[PDB]
Coordinates of C-alpha atoms in Angstrom, one line a residue:
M1 CA 68.0 -4.7 -23.5
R2 CA 67.1 -5.1 -19.6
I3 CA 66.4 -8.7 -19.0
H4 CA 65.2 -10.0 -15.6
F5 CA 65.6 -13.7 -14.8
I6 CA 63.3 -15.4 -12.1
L7 CA 65.4 -18.5 -10.8
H8 CA 63.8 -21.2 -8.6
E9 CA 66.9 -23.4 -7.8
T10 CA 70.7 -23.8 -8.3
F11 CA 70.1 -26.6 -10.8
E12 CA 67.5 -24.8 -12.8
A13 CA 70.2 -22.4 -14.2
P14 CA 69.5 -19.9 -16.9
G15 CA 72.4 -21.6 -19.1
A16 CA 72.3 -20.4 -22.6
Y17 CA 69.5 -17.9 -22.0
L18 CA 72.1 -16.0 -19.7
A19 CA 74.9 -16.5 -22.2
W20 CA 72.9 -15.2 -25.0
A21 CA 72.0 -12.2 -22.9
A22 CA 75.7 -11.7 -22.1
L23 CA 76.8 -12.1 -25.8
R24 CA 74.3 -9.8 -27.2
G25 CA 75.3 -7.2 -24.5
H26 CA 71.9 -6.9 -22.5
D27 CA 71.7 -5.8 -18.8
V28 CA 70.9 -8.9 -16.9
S29 CA 69.2 -8.8 -13.3
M30 CA 68.0 -11.9 -11.4
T31 CA 65.8 -13.0 -8.4
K32 CA 66.9 -16.1 -6.9
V33 CA 63.8 -17.1 -5.1
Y34 CA 65.4 -20.1 -3.4
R35 CA 67.6 -17.6 -1.6
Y36 CA 64.5 -15.8 -0.2
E37 CA 65.0 -13.1 -2.6
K38 CA 62.0 -10.8 -3.1
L39 CA 60.2 -10.8 -6.6
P40 CA 60.3 -7.3 -8.4
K41 CA 57.4 -5.3 -7.5
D42 CA 57.5 -3.1 -10.8
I43 CA 57.5 -4.2 -14.4
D44 CA 59.4 -0.9 -15.0
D45 CA 62.9 -2.2 -14.2
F46 CA 62.9 -4.6 -17.1
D47 CA 62.0 -5.0 -20.8
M48 CA 62.0 -8.9 -20.9
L49 CA 61.3 -11.5 -18.2
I50 CA 62.6 -14.9 -18.4
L51 CA 61.4 -17.4 -15.8
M52 CA 63.4 -20.7 -15.5
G53 CA 62.4 -24.2 -14.4
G54 CA 62.1 -25.4 -10.9
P55 CA 61.4 -28.4 -8.8
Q56 CA 58.1 -26.9 -7.8
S57 CA 54.7 -27.2 -9.4
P58 CA 52.6 -24.0 -10.0
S59 CA 50.5 -25.2 -7.0
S60 CA 53.4 -26.1 -4.7
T61 CA 52.6 -24.8 -1.2
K62 CA 54.8 -22.6 1.1
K63 CA 54.7 -25.4 3.5
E64 CA 56.9 -27.3 1.0
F65 CA 59.0 -24.4 -0.1
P66 CA 58.9 -21.7 2.2
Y67 CA 60.3 -19.1 -0.2
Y68 CA 58.2 -19.9 -3.2
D69 CA 55.0 -17.8 -3.8
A70 CA 53.5 -19.2 -7.2
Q71 CA 50.6 -16.5 -6.7
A72 CA 53.1 -13.7 -6.9
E73 CA 55.0 -15.2 -9.7
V74 CA 51.6 -15.5 -11.7
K75 CA 50.7 -12.0 -10.9
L76 CA 54.1 -10.8 -11.9
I77 CA 53.6 -12.4 -15.4
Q78 CA 50.1 -10.9 -15.8
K79 CA 51.5 -7.4 -15.0
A80 CA 54.4 -8.1 -17.4
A81 CA 51.9 -9.2 -20.3
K82 CA 49.6 -6.5 -19.6
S83 CA 52.4 -4.0 -20.4
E84 CA 53.5 -5.8 -23.5
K85 CA 56.8 -7.0 -21.9
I86 CA 58.7 -9.8 -23.7
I87 CA 58.2 -12.9 -21.5
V88 CA 59.8 -16.4 -21.8
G89 CA 58.9 -19.3 -19.3
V90 CA 60.8 -22.6 -19.3
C91 CA 59.4 -25.8 -17.6
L92 CA 58.0 -24.5 -14.5
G93 CA 58.2 -21.1 -16.0
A94 CA 56.2 -22.2 -19.0
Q95 CA 53.5 -23.7 -16.6
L96 CA 53.2 -20.4 -14.6
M97 CA 52.7 -18.6 -17.9
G98 CA 49.8 -21.1 -18.6
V99 CA 48.2 -20.3 -15.3
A100 CA 48.8 -16.6 -15.7
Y101 CA 46.8 -16.7 -19.2
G102 CA 43.9 -18.6 -17.7
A103 CA 44.6 -22.3 -17.9
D104 CA 45.8 -24.7 -15.3
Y105 CA 48.6 -27.0 -15.5
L106 CA 48.5 -30.8 -16.4
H107 CA 50.6 -33.9 -16.2
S108 CA 52.5 -35.1 -19.4
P109 CA 51.2 -38.1 -21.3
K110 CA 54.9 -39.3 -20.9
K111 CA 57.6 -38.1 -18.6
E112 CA 60.7 -37.0 -20.4
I113 CA 64.4 -36.6 -19.3
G114 CA 67.1 -36.5 -22.0
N115 CA 67.6 -35.3 -25.5
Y116 CA 64.6 -35.9 -27.6
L117 CA 63.2 -34.7 -30.9
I118 CA 60.6 -32.0 -30.8
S119 CA 58.7 -31.3 -34.1
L120 CA 57.1 -28.2 -35.3
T121 CA 53.4 -27.8 -35.5
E122 CA 51.8 -26.2 -38.7
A123 CA 51.5 -23.0 -36.5
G124 CA 55.1 -23.5 -35.7
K125 CA 56.1 -23.8 -39.2
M126 CA 54.6 -20.6 -39.5
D127 CA 56.2 -18.5 -36.7
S128 CA 58.7 -16.1 -37.8
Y129 CA 60.8 -16.5 -34.5
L130 CA 61.3 -20.1 -35.4
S131 CA 62.6 -19.8 -39.0
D132 CA 65.9 -21.3 -38.0
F133 CA 64.5 -24.5 -36.4
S134 CA 64.5 -27.6 -38.8
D135 CA 61.0 -29.3 -38.5
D136 CA 62.5 -31.8 -36.1
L137 CA 65.2 -31.0 -33.6
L138 CA 67.0 -32.8 -30.8
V139 CA 66.4 -30.6 -27.6
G140 CA 66.8 -31.1 -23.9
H141 CA 63.8 -32.4 -21.7
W142 CA 63.3 -32.7 -17.9
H143 CA 59.6 -33.0 -16.8
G144 CA 56.7 -34.8 -15.5
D145 CA 54.1 -31.9 -16.2
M146 CA 53.2 -29.6 -19.0
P147 CA 51.3 -26.2 -19.3
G148 CA 47.6 -25.4 -19.6
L149 CA 46.6 -24.1 -23.0
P150 CA 44.2 -21.2 -23.0
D151 CA 42.1 -20.7 -26.0
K152 CA 44.1 -18.0 -27.4
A153 CA 47.3 -19.8 -27.0
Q154 CA 49.0 -21.8 -30.0
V155 CA 51.1 -25.1 -29.7
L156 CA 54.3 -24.5 -32.0
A157 CA 55.9 -27.8 -31.1
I158 CA 55.3 -31.3 -29.9
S159 CA 57.3 -34.3 -28.9
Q160 CA 56.2 -37.9 -29.0
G161 CA 55.9 -37.8 -25.1
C162 CA 54.3 -34.4 -24.9
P163 CA 52.0 -32.5 -27.0
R164 CA 52.9 -29.0 -25.7
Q165 CA 56.5 -28.2 -26.1
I166 CA 56.5 -24.7 -27.2
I167 CA 53.5 -22.4 -26.9
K168 CA 52.7 -18.8 -28.1
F169 CA 50.6 -17.2 -25.4
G170 CA 51.0 -13.6 -26.9
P171 CA 52.7 -11.7 -29.6
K172 CA 55.9 -11.5 -27.5
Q173 CA 55.2 -14.0 -24.8
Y174 CA 56.4 -17.6 -25.5
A175 CA 56.9 -20.7 -23.3
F176 CA 59.2 -23.7 -23.7
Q177 CA 58.4 -26.8 -21.8
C178 CA 61.7 -28.2 -23.1
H179 CA 65.2 -27.0 -22.5
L180 CA 67.4 -25.8 -25.3
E181 CA 69.4 -23.9 -22.8
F182 CA 71.4 -27.0 -21.5
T183 CA 75.0 -27.5 -21.6
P184 CA 77.2 -30.4 -20.1
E185 CA 77.6 -28.6 -16.7
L186 CA 73.8 -27.9 -16.3
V187 CA 73.1 -31.4 -17.1
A188 CA 75.6 -32.5 -14.4
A189 CA 73.9 -30.5 -11.8
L190 CA 70.4 -32.1 -12.8
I191 CA 71.9 -35.5 -12.6
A192 CA 73.2 -34.9 -9.2
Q193 CA 69.7 -33.9 -8.0
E194 CA 67.9 -36.8 -9.7
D195 CA 67.0 -39.8 -7.5
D196 CA 67.4 -43.0 -9.3
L197 CA 67.9 -42.0 -12.8
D198 CA 69.3 -45.5 -13.2
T199 CA 66.0 -47.5 -12.7
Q200 CA 63.9 -44.8 -14.5
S201 CA 66.3 -45.3 -17.5
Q202 CA 64.9 -48.9 -18.4
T203 CA 61.6 -48.8 -16.6
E204 CA 60.7 -45.8 -18.7
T205 CA 60.3 -44.9 -22.5
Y206 CA 61.6 -41.4 -22.4
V207 CA 64.3 -41.3 -19.7
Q208 CA 68.0 -41.5 -20.8
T209 CA 71.1 -42.7 -18.8
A210 CA 73.4 -40.2 -16.9
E211 CA 76.2 -41.2 -19.7
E212 CA 73.8 -40.6 -22.7
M213 CA 73.1 -37.0 -21.4
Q214 CA 76.4 -36.1 -20.1
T215 CA 78.3 -37.1 -23.4
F216 CA 75.7 -35.5 -25.7
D217 CA 76.7 -32.4 -27.8
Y218 CA 74.4 -29.3 -26.7
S219 CA 75.7 -26.6 -29.2
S220 CA 72.8 -27.1 -31.7
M221 CA 70.1 -26.7 -29.4
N222 CA 71.9 -23.5 -27.8
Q223 CA 72.3 -22.3 -31.2
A224 CA 68.7 -23.0 -32.2
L225 CA 67.8 -20.9 -28.9
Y226 CA 70.0 -18.1 -30.0
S227 CA 68.2 -17.8 -33.4
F228 CA 64.9 -17.7 -31.4
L229 CA 66.0 -15.0 -29.0
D230 CA 67.5 -12.9 -31.6
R231 CA 64.4 -12.9 -33.6
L232 CA 62.0 -12.4 -30.7
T233 CA 63.8 -9.4 -29.8
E234 CA 64.8 -7.8 -33.1

């Protein structure tokens, strides 16, 4: 019901997570750390915590991003977990969850930017909250890194480029390295930020073109996401 977002840049938007939260009638708050907004001090003001992506890494320094405090975000995840809050972390958000749960983050075998299949693991095929995901699904991607896997965490999905797409850290604490929340306008903003998506498009296996991404139809990923959030919170 009270859902709090942590946002790390204008181009790392909540997209469909926010839309879902609006349609289902939930009570949204946000922290826009890039606006030097202060992280919540109490886990008491929210029921669920969704941390979105970001150009930073979990180890980025305040000399690079003077408003960003990865340590504080990690502690906030741990406080939240320790009270059995629902948590979801996306790209950078998924990597801070890794750190919070005892594993440091890694570089991805392949970097991925565009819309690619992810594929359920065995553990994935057994997760209640993913019932509405076909075994293979085309979803969004925009990373170079991926999350640490602590021993108690399960991988629920992989792609060809990256072996850790979705991870279950806890009974109600999930991480998506990939982006199901994309829409054409979010993807517009990401393209505007990307230096040389052109060159990377041919030089690299798993980078698509501005045109490929921009024309793509995102309604199925949004919709798969909705089924996950609905199930996670029911």
